[PDB]
Design a protein around this ligand. Structure first.
Ligand SMILES: [Zn+2]
Length: 81
């Protein structure tokens, strides 16, 4: 009769989120879903490099999360002070 059991390992923090805000970068949050973009973090999945400004981001660029437009983003001030 088997009496072996497994235990849950718990939480492995694989995120480690934290962009170094050494320069005043902004946040841009999609209003259609809540996708928050940090200019200091960038989005390497699309090719957006860390430090790329919203102005440098192509007008044809869409929210990688849902395909919402740039006008679907809000400019969020960074309270990391
Ligand atoms: Zn979105």
């Amino acid at each position: 009769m088997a009496h072996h059991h497994h235990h849950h390992m718990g939480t492995l923090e694989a995120q480690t989120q934290g962009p170094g805000s050494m320069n005043d970068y902004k946040l841009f949050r999609c209003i259609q879903c809540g996708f928050e973009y940090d200019e200091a973090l960038g989005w390497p999945e699309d090719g957006i490099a860390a430090g790329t400004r919203w102005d440098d981001i192509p007008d044809d660029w869409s929210c990688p999360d849902c395909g919402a437009a740039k006008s679907d983003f809000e400019m969020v001030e960074v309270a990391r002070s």
